[PDB]
């Protein structure tokens with residue numbers, strides 16, 4: 330029993346992290362086969378940061394302008410290209426620890442594990458959900474760029490996030506491994522705002538089922554609601570609309586607990602309208618929306 | 633910026649996880665040099681667990697009754713012994729992935745990363761605080777025993793927890809790597825209850841230091857207190873008393889902010905005696921008690937390993 334926010338084991342990714350230096354700038358890179366992937370803003374100076382013409386800055390660089398260190402070993406850069414906001418440095422050595430991997434673009438509401446790194450060395454691991462406004466609520470300091478987010482299915486690492494920026498609000502923004510930002514953000518040194526954030530309703534519901542599966546039922550009620558009437562109330566409170574696909578994805582949790590999805594929607598509606606009134610759910614005083622139905626099924630099936 | 637519960641990178645420990653089977657009972661073990669450590673109840677059948685005599689169960693076992701596997705690769709057992717509630721199995725191969733390590737027994741309030749494992753295969757990693765009642769709020773399913781908890785210092789992995797049991801309340805209990813349970817529990821299939829839990833004062837203070845570092849300091853008052861007086865008051869609110877070691881490990885955060893530990897204690901006392909009103913601290917109306925002083929430094933300074 331028990332429900333906890335947990336990240337995938339990070340070993341397979343730790344073996345890929347390297348340090349990439351250009352000029353006075355050092356950050357992290359991801360070393361897969363004979364290519365190192367890192368944020369392209371590593372090539373920018375203090376002055377270039379405001380409005381960098383990256384193609385113009387990159388053409389002026391040589392392979393020897395990039396220092397790549399894997400532990401104590403320096404990797405010789407034999408080629409450099411740019412795919413959107415990701416710099417790709419070809420090295421003369423293939424990473425022997427390269428796992429089975431793929432590059433994927435994650436959808437809002439889905440979760441992934443972040444391996445926060447500094448100077449090419451792992452520092453910590455934590456789960457983040459891609460928010461509807463395409464930010465993530467992570468923990469990143471100076472030099473964390475190039476840290477990656479991933480999921481692990483079987484032994485295949487699906488990389489979905491590379492870290493680039495912290496917004497003034499303290500949330501974080503980045504790209505996929507094709508270098509395309511999640512959200513309307515740009516890799517320039519400017520204060521940038523995200524769109525109005527919304528709450529991931531299907532995840533809140535999964536988290537309520539988790540609370541029930543772990544013995545917490547105080548928030549349930551004898552009422553039910555139609556999907557549309559629930560969505561009317563949800564949107565009033567800046568919650569994302571619930572789709573029939575979301576309802577279906579919640580089926581397994583509904584079958585395990587015997588609580589129809591629309592019955593749990595009526596509980597959430599009551600919570601949004603009455604609040605929690607000092608009560609807590611799984612130790613939280615707020616409604617948590619960073620747990621997917623899959624994250625709940627993975628931990629609570631059979632309990 | 634950002635404050636998150638963050639596990640240690642788990643790679644060094646993943647490379648030490650193996651499967652240990654006795655009969656049909658399989659759980660996890662920890663392979664370090666040429667020894668595998670696992671819970672001793674792996675030698676118990678389902679019926680034996682109700683009331684086991686481990687010394688007697690073990691005398692009937694031989695090296696050849698133990699199946700240790702790294703994946704599907706068998707490691708031959710060439711010696712066995714019981715140390716408290718931990719079985720030690722000597723194997724004929726030294727783990728080439730063995731990291732620098734030590735075995736430590738942690739105090740209540742200290743945190744560690746749990747590498748949840750099933751059949752010797754790592755499933756997930758999460759942070760746990762040892763509660764004052766010597767349970768942890770983990771997430772564990774059948775077959776999870778032998779999963780370990782650890783901290784990383786520089787490059788040394790300090791193992792401090794091995795998982796053994798789930799209490800009726802849904803919390804979890806286990807041992808250090810010398811097989812000594814945390815708390816008054818035993819490895820027997822019996823309904824066991826943990827004492828009343830309490831809030832971890834030193835970690836709440838750390839969380840308050842974290843708030844100050846980030847500019848959230850409305851709760852600072854112009855009072856101080858003695859350690860004894862604060863301890864007596866705190867217990868009335870179900871808070872743990874502070875030890876000298878607690879004061880010591882708050883030293884760095886005290887120096888960084890310039891707020892003496894006993895001054896922060898007086899501020900916390902007022903929050904307990906007056907509440908927080910509708911105000912929040914670091915965005916929360918609840919005081920957090922599962923971040924140690926080091927956890928705060930980790931988050932705000934970016935330590936690597």
Ligand SMILES: C=C[C@H](C[C@@H]1CCNC1=O)NC(=O)[C@H](CC(C)C)NC(=O)c1cc2c(OC)cccc2[nH]1
Pocket residue numbers: 356370378469470471472473474475492493494495496497501515516517518519520521633
């Ligand atoms: C090492 C990788 C860091 C990650 C950051 C560091 C602290 N924590 C992290 O996550 N990335 C960067 O430093 C980026 C670099 C750009 C060229 C993409 N820039 C920003 O994140 C940033 C600039 C800025 C601003 O500039 C006027 C105003 C207000 C907020 C601002 N944020």
Ligand SMILES: C=C[C@H](C[C@@H]1CCNC1=O)NC(=O)[C@H](CC(C)C)NC(=O)c1cc2c(OC)cccc2[nH]1
Pocket residue numbers: 330659673681772773774775776777778795796797798799800804818819820821822823824
């Ligand atoms: C694989 C390792 C599991 C961890 C468990 C499995 C599910 N989640 C986990 O954490 N460990 C075990 O199965 C232990 C076995 C030893 C005590 C011999 N037994 C219990 O955990 C247990 C016995 C019991 C009880 O006995 C009458 C009453 C009420 C609650 C109870 N729990």
